[PDB]
Amino acid sequence: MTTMTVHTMGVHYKWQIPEVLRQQLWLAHNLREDLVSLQLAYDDDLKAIWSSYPDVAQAEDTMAAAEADAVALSERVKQARIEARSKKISTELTQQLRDAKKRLKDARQARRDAIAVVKDDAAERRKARSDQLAADQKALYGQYCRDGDLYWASFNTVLDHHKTAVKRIAAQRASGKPATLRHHRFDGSGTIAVQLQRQAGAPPRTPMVLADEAGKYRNVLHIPGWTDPDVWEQMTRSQCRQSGRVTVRMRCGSTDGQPQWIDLPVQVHRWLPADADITGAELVVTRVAGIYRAKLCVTARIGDTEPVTSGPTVALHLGWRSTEEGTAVATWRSDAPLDIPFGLRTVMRVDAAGTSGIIVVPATIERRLTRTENIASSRSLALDALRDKVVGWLSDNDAPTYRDAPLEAATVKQWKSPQRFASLAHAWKDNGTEISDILWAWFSLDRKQWAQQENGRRKALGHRDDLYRQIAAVISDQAGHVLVDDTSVAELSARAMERTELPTEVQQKIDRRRDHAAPGGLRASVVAAMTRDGVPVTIVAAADFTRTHSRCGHVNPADDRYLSNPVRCDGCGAMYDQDRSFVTLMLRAATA
RNA sequence: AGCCCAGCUUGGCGGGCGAAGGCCAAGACGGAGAUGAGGUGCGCGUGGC
DNA sequence: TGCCACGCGCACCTCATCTCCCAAATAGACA
DNA sequence: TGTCTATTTGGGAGATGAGGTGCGCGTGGCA
Ligand SMILES: [Mg+2]
Ligand SMILES: [Mg+2]
Ligand SMILES: [Mg+2]
Ligand SMILES: [Zn+2]
């Protein structure tokens, strides 16, 4: 029963966001901002509690001095790098910088120890501050829901999300990595939640309950026209799409104490099992190219799938090397031959034996992403030209009032986002001057290019993601066991730009290719499919695998020879591919 | 040429250029939140040139 | 066998991991 | 006065710590 899942329904594009929904999203954003402000104040108060002790104060002073020295040396290193116009500077500067950084790290560790020794004596004060924070959070519910128009489900969703975020931040800071809460800017996107409570001894919240007009949750969430998945899968796609158009009635908070409901015309492609247990739903609103889209996600608790027992073992390895037919994003090997559909044979390549292959991404995705980049360049150039023309007209002509104030060239000149120019075009749409035409002929055009720059991009990414899911599907259809390497793409991405031996532009191109390939997404999709379909997954400790030659079992030195393929070995004196060897070593390690 | 026209990806037919108008076929489908990174684009400085 | 340009400013996007997906007590609307 | 519906609430916990990142894992060809 534990297996959670989400079924999504796409609201009709000919549906305008009601005012109640907009107010609900605004209230949710304000509530999260208030929560973040409270959390930051609480953090500052805790740090003030820590700084009260004398030993911690002395450690803080030492750490501050060390940080000042480190930042000064970093500034000098940056200046020397700028002067030399390269990354090769005097070795003395690097040694001074390393020594300063080591001293700073030691001072920070000393501060941590000073906190640790006096940790037990501040427990009462920290508990008191935590109680004050909880009281303020309760007052937020009093203000936003008891005396406000925010639905209690949305408040609870936001509060739970925030508490999970602070738990994650504390866990990260415990390891030694930086993390902090940040203020986001509202734009019109958000989420509104509905919760289906089930008390002790209550009947399951099956999908058949939600379809009833007079059900237990008729005034919380109503999804009419539920069809059994077995019957649903027999119908033709025409009937499935005609019958899947329903009108979901959803609670949408209050308005001056008066509860309100919204009717979303949604299109449903799949239904939930008759034994599901709907735990809740959420309507998510997003802006893509300044256009609002809505989607209703319903969460259900379904039973688990019996694990598989037989099947070939498939080992997967991640890379982002470049090939004439696209980026080769993965390399897979199998213990027994696999069966790949013919429609995927150009993406999930296989060998004659059927036990090995490479997963590559079509070059059309990269071409479309490059097209989006070109569109962005053209948009920026046109925006700059418009800025120049508007500033000139403002200087040489009279300034009609904008935002109930005269327009000053200092403000217009420093405008950088296109949102300001779009707003000025809207306000002066009926201005009647000439700068109202020049400022509209731009905006209209920019409303067509912008969409493309976003829309096409999404398509490309979607295409890639789709293919990945397809690939994952086939593996879960046959594999009795799947092995994945423990490569951390995030750590590599974070540390790549600082210790690269290549020029900045080459590393930028490599990182862009890695981002477009998205190896981590492919691995995540494979793991998710295996988990859903009951296939076991094993994360292999992949340390020292590309430096090991499978045929001879010798470990080559890390002399950066692995920057190209094939790679020369020292034990046997032969050139070997470092990814076939990787997957072979993974299979050997697992099959032991 | 692109983007859009009942969820998403890929195709076919018929349309729209910020508005219109949808129909059909195959496939896959676990979402949200936060954080941390990365990338692109346009300007500026410094040089080499 | 050595080289490929080093830093800012803002604006606007995606990628990589990780967690979580409630229910009891109390109050109201109705007959 | 008694069934269902809707909202309020307390969780859920025991409670140090933020600036990574040299372990590998990935990624270079051109003159
Ligand atoms: Mg490899
Ligand atoms: Mg569509
Ligand atoms: Mg057409
Ligand atoms: Zn060898």
On whether both A464 and A324 belong to a single domain, the answer is: yes
What is the CA A490 to C1' D23 distance in angstroms?
15
Dihedral pair phi/psi, residue A328, rounded to 5°:
-80, 100
Note the CA–C1' distance, A576 to B30, in angstroms. 40
Rounded to the nearest angstrom, the distance between the alpha carbon of A294 and the centre of ligand 2 is 13
Residue A153 lies in a domain: no
Q: Nucleic chain D: which protein residues 544-573 of A have CB below 7 A from it?
A: 544-547, 558, 560, 562-565
Alpha carbon A14 to its chain centroid, in Å, reads: 28
Nucleic strand B within 7 A of Cβ A178? yes
End residue of a domain, out of A68, A83, A117: A117
Co-location of A344 and A434 in the same domain: no
Rounded Cα gap, residues A255 and A276, in angstroms? 33
Q: How many domains does chain A have?
A: 4
Do A480 and A337 fall within a single domain? yes
Which residue has the closest alpha carbon to C25 C1'? A199
The ligand whose atoms approach the alpha carbon of A576 most closely is 4
> How far apart, in whole angstroms, are the C-alpha atoms of residue A573 and residue A443?
64
Q: Both A347 and A379 in a single domain?
A: no
Has residue A151 been placed in a domain?
Answer: no
Residues A402 and A538 in one domain: no
Domain co-membership, A424 together with A441: yes
Contact residues for A387 (Cβ-Cβ < 8 A; gap 6+):
A412, A413, A415, A421
Hey, CA dihedral for A43, A49, A52, A57, is it positive or negative? Answer: negative
Report resolution in angstroms. Answer: 2.9
The rounded distance, in Å, linking the Cα atoms of A251 and A210 is: 13
Helix (H, G, I), strand (E, B) or coil at A180: coil
SS3 A143: helix
Give the separation between CA A388 and CA A440, rounded to whole angstroms.
15
- Alpha helices, DSSP H only, in A362-503? 363-396, 409-413, 418-427, 435-478, 489-499
From residues 284-343 of A, list those within 7 angstroms of strand B by Cβ. Answer: 284, 289-291, 295, 297, 299
Residue A135 lies in a domain: no
Read out DSSP for A305-365? PPPP----EEEEEEEEEEETTEEEEEEEEESS-----GGGTTTB---SSSSEEEEE--HHH
Give the whole-angstrom CA distance, residue A531 versus residue A537: 8
Q: Is A390 contained in some domain? A: yes
Instruction: List strand B contacts in A 515-534 (CB < 7 A).
Output: 515, 528-529, 532
Q: Is residue A201 part of a domain?
A: yes
- The answer to whether position A150 is within a domain reads no
Give per-residue burial for A312-338: e unless 16+ CB within 10 Å, then b: bbbbbbbbbbeeeebbbbbbbbbbeeb
Cα(A378) to centroid(ligand 3), Å:
26
CA–centroid distance, A256 to ligand 2, in Å, is 37
Domain stops at, among A117, A148, A172:
A117
Q: Residue A68 CB: number of other CB atoms within 10 A? A: 12
Same structural domain, A439 and A475:
no
- Structure determination method: cryo-EM
Taken in order A497, A499, A503, A509, the sign of the CA dihedral is: negative
A43 part of a folded domain: no
Both A495 and A555 in a single domain?
A: yes
DSSP at A145: I
- Evaluate whether residue A562 is within a structural domain: yes
Residue A10, CB, strand B, below 7 Å: yes
Q: Which structural domain, as residue segments, surrounds residue A550?
A: 313-365+458-590
Helix (H, G, I), strand (E, B) or coil at A242: helix
Do A471 and A565 share a domain, yes or no?
Answer: yes
Q: Output DSSP code: residue A244.
A: T
Same domain, A357 and A413: no
Residues A477 and A448 in one domain: no
Within 7 Å: CB of A237 and strand B? yes
User: What are the structure tokens assigned to A351, written together?
Assistant: 């060998």
CATH of residue A560: 3.30.420
Same domain for A296 and A214: yes
Residues paired with A167 in a beta bridge: none
- Kind and range of the H or E element at A297? strand A291-302
